[PDB]
């Protein structure tokens, strides 16, 4: 509507996509380092073997 609050109800839901999308696109950078430690440990023969 033309009311300022209905314009401001949007902004929380605007910022929530600022906060989800920066998280889940951050999550792949947080996930590559999770994947590399597995695929190092997938081919990591334990020492004293």
């Amino acid at each position: 509507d033309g009311t300022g609050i209905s314009l401001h109800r949007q902004l929380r839901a605007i910022q929530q996509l600022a906060r989800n999308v920066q998280a889940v696109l951050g999550a792949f950078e947080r996930g590559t380092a999770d994947q590399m430690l597995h695929v190092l440990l997938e081919k990591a023969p334990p020492l004293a073997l």
């Binding site: 033309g2 009311t3 609050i5």
Partner: protein, 49 residues
Amino acid sequence: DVEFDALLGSYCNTLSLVRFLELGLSVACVCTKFPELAYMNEGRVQFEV
């Protein structure tokens, strides 16, 4: 389409039209467009005599 409706379908025709404050009940009626009336929980008026 609404650019024509603001010209044609917004005014400049009656064919059977009433305005409220045209009508003479309005001396009974305070009338005030409070647009955020959907958002209110309660609406209070205090009287003190």
